[PDB]
Symmetry: D6
Subunit: 170 residues, 12 copies
C-alpha cells in the first residue's frame, strides 16, 4: 500500500509544513524555521547532487505520508545517513518499519552501499528500540551533541551493514 | 492568548509588511523611515532568503489573522547575541498579546537558537513600554542620547537586555 | 486631511506615464514630454534602491491618483534635496497644492532630517512663484535662459526653505 | 483629431504589418522583411537610445494611422533625419501635412534641433512637391543611392532649418 | 496561382515547420536528417533572428493556409550569391504552385536583395525537378558525385544557377 | 505499420518520468530508478543540441505513447552507436519489439549512415537475447559482473550488427 | 600658449587622486576629500562612454600636470553644462586660471556648441568671483547655506555666460 | 607629523597583519583570523559603500601607524561608530589623542554627523579614561556583550555630539 | 608614391589614432569632436572587431612609418554603397600621397568589396580638396546646408560620389 | 615547543598543502583520497574563502618553517560543535609538537569561537594516538564500525570529544 | 621533412600575415583583411568546433611553410572541403603534392571521410592540373561564383572518394 | 620502486599535448591524433572537479615524465572504471608497463574501492594482450570492427580484473 518515490517540486508544500513544525524537526535535530523560498531554492540547488536521495512516501490514495532521506552518500566509503519522518496525522499506524526496510532495500540492493547509519535521541528510547528491531546496532553515544529545546542532549549513532542485511535469513 | 503563533515570514505576507512599513506611526517604534515601495521590500526579502543573521516572523491567531511581526536580527554566532524587535498591528494593540509574543521570541532565542543574550531599543518617551519590558525580565544597560531622529527631533532610547540563564531559570 | 502622500508603486506607472507624455504638464518640470512605458518602467526598476530620491503619489479618499510629489538629488552631507510637484489637470484649482507642498516639507524636515529644500519654477509662472512664497520659500536665484521650452530659452527662479525656518 | 505619441510595445503588431509591406517600405528604402522577433528585439535594444524618437499617429478613435520618426539625432550638429509613413488604409486623406508640421514642431520647439533633413525618391515627385510645400528645400540629388525594385534609383535630400521654421510668419 | 504570398517566417509558424522537418519524405529533398525536436527548432530560430546571411519564408494562399517554405541561405555580400531551397507541403504538391514560388524567390533575390547569383542543388534521381528548374531559367553548372547519403546510399545532385542579368532581362 | 518512431519532445517527459522511476523497467537498462522530473527536464534541456544521441518515442495509431527507443554514444569517426529500447509494461507481449528494433536499425543505417550498432542485455534475460539474435545481432562479449542489479553483480551480453549485414 | 587642455587619461589618475584627497583643493569644489584610488578608477571606468561630461587635464610645455578642467551635466536639449576647475597648489598664482577658463569656454562654445555655461563659487572666495566676472561670467544666484564646508553651511554664487556673449 | 588618509589596496598587507593579531583584535571584539583573500575580497566589495570611511595613519616617513574607521554611518540619524587601532610597534607614543581628534574633526566638520559613538572594554579603564579626556561620555554599560578570551565581558558605549565638539571652546 | 600600402587597423596602431583623434585640426576634416580618451578609443575598437559594416585601414610607407588613415564606413550590402573618409597625418600633408591613397581606397571598394558606389563629404570652405576629389573622379551630388557645427559656426559640405562602373572603366 | 604558532591558511601555503594532500601516508589519517590536482585544491580554496563553517590553519615554528595543519570544520552555530583534524608533516612527526598543537586548537575553539564541543575521529588501529588524545582530555563517545575504506579494507574509528567547560576549568 | 600539425595560438602571427595578403587570399576567394583580434577571437570561438581541422605545415627546422584545412566536415554525408596555402617564400619548391597527399591520408585513414572536394579558379589551370595529378576529378564548373579582383570568375569544383584513394594501387 | 604515479597537473600539459598529437601513440587509445593545446587545456579546466576520472602522470627518480595512466568512466553504483596507459616512446621496452599497470590496480582497488577494472586493446597487438593476461586481466569480449584505425575497421579485446581477484 505504501510507496517510496523521488521528491518532486509538487511535494514542497508538504515538506514546508514539516520543516516548520517544531515537534517534527526536533527528531532531526534541525531548527524549525524555513521559508518556502529557502526550501525551494535549496531544492533547486541540489537537483543534480548525487550525494543525496530524498523520497516522499505515498499510500494507494497518493496521500503524502512522510519523508525518507539518504544523505552524505560517500562513494569511496560506501556509506550514508538515513533519516525518516512520518507526518503527525499518520504516526502510530505501524508504517515506520515498512519504510525503514524499504530504505535499506534501496540502499543495499540499488545504491550498492556498504553501511547505513542514523542518529536518534537517547531520550527517545522507543525510536531506539524500533531501530534495533529493524537491525540497527548502537556504535556511539554522542554526549551533548545537539542543543534541543533548551539543553544539550545525547544521541545514539546506530548502523547496519550491507552484508548483514542482504544475508540475514540465509 | 496562547492560540497566538510565530512562524517564518513568507512571500504571501509581504502585502501585510508593506502596509506596516509605510505607516509612520508604526515605523517610529523601530526608528525607521516609513517609505518602502513593494519592489524594495520584495527585492530585499529575496536578497536575504539565505541570510542566517536574521529570523523574521509573522504572528497569527487561530483564524490566521496576521497580528504583527517579530524579528531577531544581527544574530552573532560568536557572541551569541541578537536584537529583538516587535510590531503589533494597530487593530491589535492593547489586547494583551504583547507579553505572550515577547515570551515566544525569547523562547525561540533561548530554547532553539541557543543564544546567550537578547537586547532591544525602546524610546525613553514611551515609559509604559520600558516598564512592560522590565516586567518581562529585561533590564536597562544603556540610555542612548539623541540616538535617533524621529518626528522632528533627536530622541533618546533605552537599550535593554536579558540573558539566556535568567530566562531558562524558572 | 484626506489627501495622502505615499510611495510610488509599479501599479501607479500608467498614471505617471500619462503625465510624462503630456506636454502641458512636463513643461512645468522642464522635461521632454516623451517617454515610452518601457523606458519609464526600466528606469523605475533601475532606481528601486536609489537612496538619493523619494517619489510619492498623491491619492484622495477614494484612492484616486491626484498627482505626484518628488524629492530628488538628496545629498547625504549637505542635507539638501530638490522638490517638485505635479497635480493632474482635472484636480488643479481645488486648492490641493498648498497642502501637498506642506506634506513634502514635513517629510523632508521631520523624517529625512534635511537642512534645505529648493525648487525651480518658471519666471513666467508668477502664480506658482507667489504660492511657493506663501508656503515659506524665498528666491535665491533667477537663472537666465536656463531651459529651452516651447521654442525659446526661458528663465526660472530657484527658491528654497530651511529646516530651522519650517520647524518654527 | 490626430496625435503623435511615443511608440509603445502594444503598437508593434501595427509596425510589423508596415515593415513587411513592400509598397510601404519602398518609401523608406528598406527591405520589406522583418520577423516580429527581430522587430521586438531591436525595439528592446533601443529603449534608452537618445539618438532617436519614434512616434505613432492616432486619431480620436485611437486607430493607428501612421508612423513618424526622427533618427540619427546628433547633439553637437543639432540635426536629425525625419521620415514618415501613413498606413495604406489612411492615405489620401490629407493627413500628411498636419503630421509633417507636428514633427517639425517637435523637432524645433521641443528637441531644440537646428536642422531636419529627409530623403525622397526622385521618382516620387508628388511627395517631393508636398515636402516643398511644407518648407523643405532640396540640398542634394543622390545618384543611384538605393537599389529599389530591380534598379538603382536617385533620391532627393531635402532640409529645413529651425530659424526658418520658427520665424516664417514673423 | 498569383494569390500565393511569401512572408517572413514567424514563431507561430514553427509547428508547421516542425511537422515538415520531421518528415523523412520531405527532408530527403533538402538532404537533411528528418529529426528535430521542437526545442532544437525553436532555439535555432532564436539564435538566428538577427542573422543577415539568411532569409526564411513561409508561403500562404489567400485563406492563410500554409503551403510550404522558401529559404535563401548562405547569402554572401561580396560575391552576391545565395542558395535557394524550397518545400511544398505534401497536400499541395502537384497543384502548379512550384513555378510561381520559384519565380517569387527569384524576384526577392534579384529585385530586393540585389543578388547576382542564385544556385540550388537537386537530386539527379529527380529528373522531372531538374527539368522544371531548367524551364524556370536555371542551368546545370555541376553534377556532384556521391555528394549526399540519402536513404541508404550515396547520391548525386545537380547544382544549378541563374544570374540576376538573365532574370531581369525580360 | 501504424507504430511510429519520432523525436522525443518536452510534452512526452511525464511519460519518460514514469518509466525512469519504475524499478522493473530501469532494471533492463541497468539504471537507478530515481529521477525527479526536474532532473529529467534539466538534462533534456542540457542535451537539446547534443549530436551524440537521438531519443525517440514510439506511438501507435491513437497517439498513445508505447515506449522509447534511443541511439546513444553516436561516434563521428568510428560510426558506431549504442541502441536501447523500452516498451511500456501495458504494451509488451504484443509483438512490437521486433518492428521497433528494425525501425531503429533502419534509422541508424539508412539515415545516420552508421557502420555498427551494439547493445547490452542481461545474460539472465535469454528471451531478449534470443529476440536480438533473430533481428541479426550477434554476441561479441559476455561482460563479467558488469552491473550491480537488485543486490548482486550480474553479467550482460554485448551484441552488435553491422551496416553491410543489415543493408542486405 | 604652451598650456594645453587634453582628455583625462588613465595614466593621469594618480595626479587626480592626489587632488581628490586634498582637503584644501576639494573645498573649492564642495566635495568630500576622501576617495580611494579604487573608487576613483572604478568611477572613471564607469563613465568612459558617458556623453554628459568632458574631463580635461592641463599640461604645460614639459608635460607637467597643471590642473584639471571639467564640463559636467552637459544637457542635450537645453545646451547647458557646469564648468569647474582646479589648479594644482604649486602652479597657482602664475596667472594660468584666466587662460584656462578661456580654453574651457572655447571648447564649450566652438566645439560642443553649447548655449550656456554656469559654475558655483564660494561667496567667501571673492577673488575667484572677481576673476570669473572678468572672464565674462555674471551672477544669477546667491545660494543660501547650500553646502556644509569645514563645519558650517556656506553660501555660493552661481554664475553664467552665454554662447552669444562669448562668440562676440 | 601624523596624517589620516583613505585606505588603499597597497595598505592591505599592513591591515592583514593587524587583523590576525589576537591582542589587537581583542580591542575591536573581532575574531583574529582573516586570510588575505577574505580581506581583499571584502575591501573590493565595499569600495563604493557610503556607510563607511576607513583611514590609514601615516607619519612624515609614510610609515603605517594605525587605523581609524567610521562605520555604520547613518544619514537620517546622522550617527556613526568610531574605532581605532595603533600598531604594536607605535603604541605608547601619545598618538592616540591626536588621532581621535582628527576623526572627530572629520566626522563633524566634513561628514556633518550629529553623533559619534564607540565601544570600549570595561576591563580597559585606561582606554576609557583617554576617551573621556577626549570628550566622550558613557551612555551605556553593556552586560556580557562580547565573548572575549574565554568569557563574556562588559563594554562601555560612549559618545560625543557635533554641537558639543564644534563649540566647546566658544 | 607607389610604395605606400593600406592594411587593416591593429591594436598596436591605436596610439597613432589617439593622437589624430585628439587633434582639433585633424578632426575638423571629419566633422568630429577632437576628444577621445584612449579607453573610449580602445573599447570602441573592441566593440567593432566583428562589425562587417566598416573597414578601417592604416597607411604605411616602405619604412613602416604610419602615414594616415583610410576608412570605408556604413557599408550597405543591399545598396552596395559606403562612405570613404581619409586623414593624412600633419607631417605628411602636401607630399602627393593623397591621390594614391584615394585610388587605393577606390580599388579596395571596387575590386575587392564589390561595391557599387562610394561617397564622401568635404567642407565647401576647402575648395582645393573639392577640386582634387573631382580630378580623382568624384562628382558633386549634394551641397548640404549648415550640415555641421565646426569651429563656432554651421558649415556647408559637398557630398560627392563615384560609381564602380566609372572607376573600373579605364 | 611554545614558539609554534597557528595562523590562517593563505594562498602562498597551497604548495605545502598540495604536497600533504597527495601523500597516501598523510591522507590516510584523515580518511581521504590522496589525489588532488593543484587546480582542484586552489579552486576549492577560492570557493570557501567566505565559508564561516570552517577555519583552516597552518602551523609554523619561529623560523617560518611550515610544520603542519590544523582544521576546525563543520562548525555549527546552534549546536556549538566542530570537528578537529590535524596533520603534522612527516619531517616533524615525533618531536613533541602534537600536544601543543592540540592544545592551541582547543584554545582557539573554546576561548575565541566560543564553541561548546570539539570532536575528532581517529583510527582504532592507531591506539597510541587514541591514548594521546585521552591524555589531552578527549573521551571516546563512539567506536564506528567499518566506517572508512582505507588501504584495502574497512576500518573502525573512535569518535572522541571534549567540552568547553572541561577545557576551561583548569 | 614536412609535417602537418594542429594549428596553435603561437602560429597566429604567421596566419595573420597570410590572411592580409591579397595574392594569397585570392586562391581561397577570401577578402584579404583581417585584424589580429578578429583572427584570434574567431580561433577562440572554434576551438571545440568538430566541423573543422586546421593544420600548419612545418619542415625539420620548425619553419612555418603553409596551411592545410579541412572544413565543413559533415558526419552524415562524410564529406569535407579541402583547402591549402603555401607561403610565398616557400612556393615552387614542390611541396604542394606531398601536402595534398598528407591531407587525403588524414581525411581517409583517420577521419574516415567518404569524399573530399575543393574549389580552384578556372583561370589557375596549373593548380587544376596539379589537383588532377593528385587524383581529383572535376564535378563542376561554377559560373561567376566569386568576385575576385574586379570581376566575377568561374571555379572548378573537384573531388576524390575514399574508396578510390584507399585502393588505387591495389 | 622509483617510478611514481601522481595527479596530472597543468605544468604537465605540454607533455600530454605531445603524446596527444602523436599518431603512433594515440593509435593505442583509438583516438584521433589532433588536439590543439587550447582544446587540451580547456577540457582539462572543464574536468577539474569531475569525479568520474582520475588522470595520472608517471615520473621516474629524476622527475622525467614517463607516461600517462588514466582511470575513466568511474561508476558510483557499479564500481567499475576503464583503465588506459601510455608509455612515452623513449621509455618503452624498459619493463615499466607491468609495474605501472600494477600501480593503477592498487589505486583502483585499495584506494577508490572499485569492484572491476576493464580495458580495450587491439587484437592486432597480441604482446599487449599477453602482458595484460600476465597482470591478471582476462578477455570478456572480442569487439568486431569497433574502431576505424589507419584506414580500416579493427577488432579489440575487452579485458577485466576484479577487486576480489587482485586483493588475493
Amino acid at each position: 500500500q505504501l510507496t517510496l518515490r523521488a521528491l518532486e517540486r509538487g511535494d514542497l508544500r508538504f515538506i514546508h509544513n514539516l520543516n516548520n513544525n517544531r515537534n517534527i524537526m526536533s527528531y532531526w535535530f534541525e531548527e524549525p524555521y524555513e521559508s518556502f523560498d529557502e526550501l525551494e531554492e535549496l531544492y533547486n540547488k541540489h537537483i543534480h547532487d548525487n550525494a543525496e536521495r530524498r523520497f516522499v512516501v505515498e499510500d494507494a490514495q497518493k496521500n503524502l505520508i512522510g519523508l525518507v532521506e539518504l544523505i552524505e552518500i560517500n562513494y569511496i566509503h560506501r556509506s550514508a545517513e538515513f533519516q525518516i519522518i512520518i507526518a503527525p496525522e499518520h504516526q502510530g499506524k505501524g508504517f515506520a518499519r515498512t519504510l525503514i526496510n524499504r530504505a535499506l532495500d534501496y540502499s543495499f540492493t540499488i545504491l550498492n552501499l556498504h553501511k547505513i547509519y542514523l542518529h536518534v535521541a537517547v531520550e527517545n528510547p522507543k525510536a531506539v528500540h524500533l531501530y534495533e528491531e529493524c537491525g540497527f546496532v548502537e556504535e556511539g553515544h554522542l554526549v551533548e551533541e545537539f542543543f534541543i529545546n533548551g539543553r544539550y542532549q545525547d544521541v545514539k549513532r546506530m548502523y547496519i551493514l550491507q552484508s548483514k542485511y542482504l544475508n540475514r535469513s540465509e
